[PDB]
Design an enzyme around this catalytic site. Structure first.
Site, short mmCIF file in Angstrom:
data_model
loop_
_atom_site.label_atom_id
_atom_site.label_comp_id
_atom_site.label_asym_id
_atom_site.label_seq_id
_atom_site.Cartn_x
_atom_site.Cartn_y
_atom_site.Cartn_z
N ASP A 128 0.83 -1.19 0.00
CA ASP A 128 0.00 0.00 0.00
C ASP A 128 0.87 1.25 0.00
O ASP A 128 1.90 1.30 0.67
CB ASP A 128 -0.93 0.01 1.21
CG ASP A 128 -2.00 1.06 1.11
OD1 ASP A 128 -2.63 1.16 0.04
OD2 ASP A 128 -2.22 1.79 2.09
N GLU A 198 -0.69 -1.39 -4.75
CA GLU A 198 -1.88 -0.55 -4.83
C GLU A 198 -1.44 0.89 -5.08
O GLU A 198 -0.89 1.53 -4.18
CB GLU A 198 -2.71 -0.65 -3.55
CG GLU A 198 -3.48 -1.95 -3.42
CD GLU A 198 -4.01 -2.19 -2.03
OE1 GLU A 198 -5.16 -1.79 -1.76
OE2 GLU A 198 -3.29 -2.80 -1.21
#
Ligand SMILES: CCCCCCCCCCCCCCCCCC(=O)OC[C@H](COP(=O)(O)O)OC(=O)CCCCCCCCCCCCCCCCC
Ligand SMILES: CCCCCCCCCCCCCCCCCC(=O)OC[C@H](COP(=O)(O)O)OC(=O)CCCCCCCCCCCCCCCCC
Ligand SMILES: *[C@@H]1O[C@H](CO)[C@@H](O[C@@H]2O[C@H](CO)[C@@H](O)[C@H](O)[C@H]2NC(C)=O)[C@H](O)[C@H]1NC(C)=O
Ligand SMILES: *[C@@H]1O[C@H](CO)[C@@H](O[C@@H]2O[C@H](CO)[C@@H](O)[C@H](O)[C@H]2NC(C)=O)[C@H](O)[C@H]1NC(C)=O
Ligand SMILES: [Ca+2]
Lengths: 200, 458
Positions: A128, A198
């Site tokens: 992330d 991501e």
């Protein structure tokens, strides 16, 4: 959510049904209650450069930040610490200080966290906020979208072009070194370790 | 041969290719680790009590063959004929097909790392191993035994690597998979009886320990002492190899595996992971080269009574080999691998083998009432052949009652097909029989240049 024994029972039960397990990984920042940050702001040992610190001019309740960089949720991305008497950088919130990934002691501590969960039997990771990993070290101001706007009113994140705080040179090499860390646990057939990123 | 080299031939004979294929199918039927280790120990008791009963029959009768002179002395010609018929078309070619199929599982597995090989590759490689061994043994009778001792050395080394490296991992604390070993299991009569079929395949060779281990320094005392020491010590090496498999694999990872020892050598011996597909592939064609030495011994002694064709057990004039028998075994073994499938050839083998192990051990008890005054030097206690003939009807009736598949019909119909050939060619010798048998023998004699073996009964 439970204990570590509750997690280890879930990994064994997932494998016994033929399933796989991937988990989230947050490399970009920690909390301000992490033990690295409590040693960073007291200048203890090697932890002094675990976070990005710069001098600032905080007096009578207002800080003058080193540049005009903004956080994603929107105000200045520099916050004054009273113990260190310096300002630290954060991309998201003042309770989430950013790690200094130009420090090779920080990158070794992140690789130990990856090896910890791969030893427990996790089959992969979703990374992330990888585009927020590196920032420019020249610390120059961003370009405003509206150039006639007065700089004391520029507080929303959508009012700047983020050329110096996202997708810097060397960021893709940090993601490639994570892939090489997980390649040592992927040499067994049928136990390949997945890596997804991501970036929205 | 003393006592120590008497138990070394027993260990070298009984360790075969079974321990590298059988752990998947024992765990597939008893789905827990705990019951999986009890069947591996209870199969070594059936091999030890079974070999003791064959030790009494071997000294009482003293005739060449297999179980063929044992069944004739107890029941007469009809069960002796059906054993010569079932060992020709069922027992011996399926044993040659399971071994050559087990060779091709271990060559094709490291090339398909995380997936199965297709069924066309494991079968077309197994047929190339049958036709290679059937021509090498049909040309060069002494070449098979020069390479036989380096194929046994390659087998004991890769067994000792797995046992030792599994006891090292067991000391470090890799004992999580043994924690709940009795949770989720089967007391069905068809799940246990097929778990006994696969475990007892790994002990194949206990019924032929008589002929080679009776040239000792002191028989009738060292033969039953080499069985009580030799076969329980290989039972300890089979339990210790399953203990080593369960230190690096879960019980679900072992079922999801193509060859069980390649998966072991991929998690332990990492920079040298190719030695396990190399040494098992040497040791498996050595177990198929060894079964072509025995081609023609029972065929000769059954044809001397008129219970088997005499064109078989002929000897080639050049390259003095039993060439019509080796070619006949290679043809039927190639037919058997087209439907194929280990776990479907082991059921077909063990149904016909344990039907005649049970008739032979029952003949030990029948000859205690009928054939007394016959000088038994070895004499086992009577409770040992009674338990061995009660398990032998449990291993025959329980698959054909609870879990009936199609192989138990094709095996019964092939054995009862021989009972037709008894009543037309042996019992009621007609006129049209020997004028089919003699031109076939005459024309196959000029084709293969094979003669009768200038010999005597022995
Ligand atoms: C589909 C189901 C049925 C399938 C049947 C398929 C039959 C195919 C037969 C293929 C035979 C292959 C033989 C070649 C193998 C050579 C192996 C070797 O190393 O030989 C060394 C040996 C050494 O000779 P050297 O080279 O001179 O030293 O060479 C040979 O013996 C070659 C002789 C070939 C033998 C052919 C035997 C075929 C017998 C068929 C009899 C049929 C009679 C049926 C009558 C019924 C009447 C009711
Ligand atoms: C090289 C390989 C081929 C050579 C060996 C096989 C011979 C080829 C011809 C096969 C037999 C031809 C018809 C039978 C001729 C003899 C009949 C007779 O009267 O016997 C007298 C015979 C005595 O004859 P003698 O040898 O002249 O004294 O009596 C018996 O031996 C009774 C036992 C019969 C055994 C039959 C063996 C059948 C072999 C073929 C099996 C077919 C099924 C294969 C598996 C199914 C698919 C998986
Ligand atoms: C930083 O952003 C916050 C918004 O979370 C601003 O704080 C208050 O925001 C509310 C609206 O939600 C206003 O009604 C208040 O008037 C704001 N407080 C003040 C003191 O004006 C805050 O102004 C922003 N800037 C700084 C420097 O903290
Ligand atoms: C943002 O940009 C605009 C023009 O790019 C600046 O100027 C305003 O433009 C609007 C467009 O119609 C006029 O109505 C206003 O009179 C302009 N002047 C102002 C708002 O002082 C504008 O100043 C820039 N900054 C902001 C905060 O809007
Ligand atoms: Ca960052």
């Amino acid at each position: 959510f439970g204990t570590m024994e509750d997690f280890e029972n879930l990994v064994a039960a997932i494998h016994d049904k033929g399933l796989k397990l991937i988990i989230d990984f947050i490399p970009n920042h920690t909390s301000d209650k992490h033990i690295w940050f409590q040693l960073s702001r007291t200048r203890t040992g090697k932890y002094t450069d675990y976070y990005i610190w710069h001098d600032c001019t905080h007096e009578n309740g207002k800080t003058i930040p080193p540049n005009n960089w903004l956080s994603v949720y929107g105000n200045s991305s520099w916050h004054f610490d009273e113990v260190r008497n310096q300002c630290y950088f954060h991309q998201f919130m003042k309770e989430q200080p950013d790690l200094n990934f130009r420090n090779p002691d920080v990158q070794e501590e992140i690789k130990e966290i990856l090896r910890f969960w791969l030893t427990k039997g996790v089959d992969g990771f979703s990374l992330d906020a990888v585009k927020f990993l590196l920032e420019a070290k020249h610390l120059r101001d961003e370009i405003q979208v509206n150039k006639t706007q007065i700089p004391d009113t520029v507080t929303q994140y959508s009012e700047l072009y983020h050329d110096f705080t996202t997708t810097q040179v060397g960021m893709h090499d940090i993601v490639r070194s994570f892939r090489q860390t997980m390649d040592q646990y992927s040499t067994e057939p049928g136990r390949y370790r997945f890596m997804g990123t991501e970036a929205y | 041969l003393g006592l120590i080299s008497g138990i070394s031939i027993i260990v070298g004979t009984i360790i075969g290719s079974g321990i590298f294929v059988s752990p998947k199918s024992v765990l597939s039927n008893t789905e827990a680790v705990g019951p999986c280790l009890i069947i591996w120990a209870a199969c070594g008791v059936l091999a030890t009590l079974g070999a003791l009963c064959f030790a009494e029959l071997g000294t009482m009768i003293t005739k060449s063959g297999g179980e063929y002179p044992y069944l004739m002395e107890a029941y007469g010609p009809i069960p002796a004929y059906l054993f010569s018929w079932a060992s020709l078309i069922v027992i011996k070619p399926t044993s040659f097909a399971i071994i050559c199929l087990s060779f091709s599982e271990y060559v094709c597995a490291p090339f398909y790392v995380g997936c199965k090989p297709p069924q066309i590759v494991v079968k077309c490689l197994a047929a190339a191993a049958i036709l290679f061994i059937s021509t090498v043994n049909s040309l060069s009778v002494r070449l098979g035994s020069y390479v036989q001792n380096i194929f046994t050395a390659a087998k004991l080394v890769i067994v000792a690597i797995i046992i030792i490296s599994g006891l090292v991992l067991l000391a470090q604390g890799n004992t999580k998979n043994f924690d709940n070993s009795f949770e989720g299991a089967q007391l069905s009569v068809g799940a246990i009886s097929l778990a006994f079929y696969n475990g007892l395949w790994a002990y194949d060779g206990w019924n032929q320990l008589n002929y080679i281990t009776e040239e000792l320094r002191n028989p009738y005392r060292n033969l039953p002492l080499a069985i009580i020491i030799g076969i329980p010590l290989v039972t300890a090496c089979y339990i210790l190899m399953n203990v080593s498999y369960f230190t690096v694999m879960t019980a679900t990872e072992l079922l999801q595996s193509q060859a069980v020892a390649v998966t072991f050598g991929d998690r332990v011996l990492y920079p040298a992971s190719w030695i396990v597909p190399l040494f098992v592939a040497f040791s498996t064609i050595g177990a198929a080269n060894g079964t072509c030495f025995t081609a023609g011994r029972l065929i000769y002694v059954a044809g001397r009574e008129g219970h088997m064709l005499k064109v078989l057990s002929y000897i080639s004039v050049r390259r003095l080999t039993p060439a019509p028998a080796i070619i006949f075994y290679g043809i039927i073994a190639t037919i058997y691998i087209i439907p194929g499938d280990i776990n479907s050839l082991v059921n077909y083998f063990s149904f016909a083998a344990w039907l005649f192990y049970g008739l032979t051990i029952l003949g030990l008890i029948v000859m205690r009432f009928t054939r007394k005054e016959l000088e038994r030097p070895i004499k086992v206690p009577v409770v040992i052949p009674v338990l061995m003939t009660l398990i032998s009807v449990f291993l025959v009736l329980a698959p054909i009652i609870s879990k009936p598949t199609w192989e138990y019909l094709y095996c019964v119909l092939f054995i009862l097909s021989g009972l037709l050939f008894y009543f037309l060619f042996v019992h009621y010798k007609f006129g049209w029989a020997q004028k089919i048998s003699k031109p076939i023998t005459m024309h196959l004699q000029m084709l293969m240049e094979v003669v009768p073996p200038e010999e005597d009964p022995e």
